[model samples]
Target: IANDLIGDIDLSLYFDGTKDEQNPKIEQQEILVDGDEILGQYLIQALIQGPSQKGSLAPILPKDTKLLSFDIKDDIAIINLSKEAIVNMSATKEQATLEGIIATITQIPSINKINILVDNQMVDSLGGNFDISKPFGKEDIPNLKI
Candidate 1:
């Protein structure tokens, strides 16, 4: 069973493979906490921190991106992020960001699905290439090199 305490939580942050790669990779990491923030909020914070290793893994979201809100009901986690999350991001990078979020959240057994919102609005797509109108689960994540 997973503990609800604020402590080390294993996460998977997706990133494009090393130079000359075609697919993404999921890098394992741990987030240590001692704050009163909710688990969902902490997860978002860790994601926004980007990969721990600079050269091996690149960031998925814009640096200024912020988490507006995070809620969980019926095993579905709804995350509202600021528009900066997608600003100037390419389709591939957007996919990587989404995949990273899904892959990371799915680590929690209680969270079966994830619904992402940009600035509290439903977006057709993050980059106008892939669909983002529904919730995503572990099965929906792309097959990464990791």
Candidate 2:
């Protein structure tokens, strides 16, 4: 329920996974909006690589991957990712690509589900399994796309 949350929340606190990160946290902020209770807030943060630091699976998300645009209609949140996201990530790194996008959208409460769109249309997921038509729930396993 988007109404459950109000105002902006700090995302850095959720980074408890030490396996990927040294400090396991980065400076990022997400804001929840009123009326739009389903996905109450916007996620504004950057993704960091894992602790191993070398050849690590963690995809280095582009610092320019900001929240380009967003809209809520018919219980769906249509998010427009930053163009820099494509430039920062490569198709070869599938896991990192998915993680980066998931991490950003999952931060919103009302956004219990979402669909990815490029140039305003649903598209195939980077790593596979997930399709733009698939609905994502918060409880859904982190790595399981589609």
Candidate 3:
């Protein structure tokens, strides 16, 4: 990645209902990434840590959530999370989570799908209305894409 001088990439920064929201929306954020970052793990961690902007955008995952593990096989990225990630979410927040996640991780050339695990075990949902039992692809949520 060092061959490129421009390191900023666009990411799906989720809506902050807390900031001001009557509905759900996808916010694209161009963020500067640095050399000290740790592989794909940095992106997931960046999501948890959140944005540089103070406006309506925010991280999709809960702030307290920690990425316990990250793995890749074939075209899939598997992420394992800590117990703190399991907070209840509205259907809006939930779907936005998918948008944020899919938008970020799928940017990798080798990854198209993502499977999430909680404390190393697969879960039914990310405290959302839909099931996340299987790996999700870009096709899974078409409306949110640009």
Candidate 4:
């Protein structure tokens, strides 16, 4: 394993926040990921880290948000977030946040479905619009950017 893959990767995802952020922009950032689990986990961390410098994307997830757990059950991807994941975001930001995650995950994994949870329990909505109680697909997010 002398020539092994380590540290720094470019994963594209969307983020929307701040007064100037109205539309989701496609941005790429460098991260460290080697495997399925690591990739999945680090992607979320990047999203939480917000968009890159001079980037349009703001912090999609709260600064305190952490991926509690992640798993793939058949066609569904289970993403568990801490209680901080539950925030009072606007309807637009909430959708963008979710679609960003969905877009990133589905692009790599065959699973196009996502199941979101807070504190390992099912949630109604991340903000106030849309429902996160059931599994959702990329097609569910109409405003999602590529």
Candidate 5:
């Protein structure tokens, strides 16, 4: 049942870096598996797994944070995160995490914008610092740390 194999899906997963106190870095990777889920879902899984490279720091979202749902409409990707996703994050960390998510999802051609939700509800901020009430596109993201 695994005979059919398609080409790899190239993705850019972002992670915190040690070089700068702010921002995150993008790492290019390829996904070999194929499934019914959308590409965004696969990318989210990769983001949750954190960076595999030695020097890269993990994203602000906890490893156990559950992805409540992932959906796309009008070229906008809507991501729902569990409450645990923002339990204990600093302003910088929350910002970096949201940037990472926006950067990663926008890499897909079909997904031009992103809207993040906590526990299925639209929130004005995560951790009470970063404004997350509106949808974001690639242009909205600031320069990431290298």
Candidate 6:
């Protein structure tokens, strides 16, 4: 049985090296055993947890702009924000907002790339001259925004 082969595992311990590591208080235990499975249940669970939610400091998005959908697949996170997430977003705010969201999910090793969307569509280009293609990595992010 697959269930017996893959037992319940702590969803948070996969991130054990960084400051944002998942709950460290929980003890580790092997609940399943599948020697042939390269990707165990625990590994799959960690990937599933990425890009599951979204938020902002201020109500920059329209009332309808909430987190519509988010998923981590093929090493990329595709985020679909509510329509409100696109409206009322200034150029500077937009950069900052997208950067923050990227930073949050990228903390998880499984998520290396991010693609943000509005209402289930890709934002091919950002208005007002903010470069979206620049590399955003853990070592490079600093106190940006003036």
Give each model a TM-score: 0.65, 0.44, 0.68, 0.69, 0.65, 0.45
Clashing pairs in 5: none
lDDT of 3 at 61: 85
* Tens-digit lDDT track of model 3 for 37-118: 2356778888889877867886688888999988776667888899988888877887888878878877676677888899
Task: Note each model's CA RMSD in angstroms.
Answer: 17.0, 14.1, 16.6, 16.2, 17.0, 15.3
Off by over 4 Å in 4: 1-34, 142-146
Compute the lDDT of residue 18 as modeled in candidate 4: 40
lDDT of 4 at 53: 78
Cα lDDT of model 4 by residue, 1-146, tens digit:
23222333556444443455676555454454445556666776777777877876677788878888887666577899998888788877888888888887775454668898999899888876778878989787663322
lDDT of 1 at 56: 85
Ranking of candidates on lDDT, top first: 3, 4, 1, 5, 2, 6
Candidate models: Cα lDDT each = 0.71, 0.48, 0.73, 0.72, 0.70, 0.47
Model 1, span 1-146: residue lDDT tens:
64434444555555544554675555545554422237777888888878887468988777788999887765677888898866655667777777888888767656778888998998766665566677877676553211
For model 5, the run of ten residues with the poorest summed lDDT: 1-10
lDDT tens digits by residue: candidate 5, 43-123: 887898778778667765688888888877656788888887766566678777877887887777667788889898987
Supply candidate 2's per-residue lDDT for 125: 56
Quote the lDDT for 99 in model 5: 74
Model 1: lDDT equals 0.71
Candidate 4 Cα deviation (angstroms), residue 21: 62
Candidate 6 residue 59 C-alpha distance from true site, Å: 5.9
- Provide the global lDDT of candidate 4 against the true structure: 0.72
Residue-wise lDDT of candidate 2 within 42-64, one digit each (tens)? 34333422224565455445554
Superposed model 3: Cα runs more than 4 Å off: 1-38, 142-146
Off by over 4 Å in 6: 1-64, 125-146
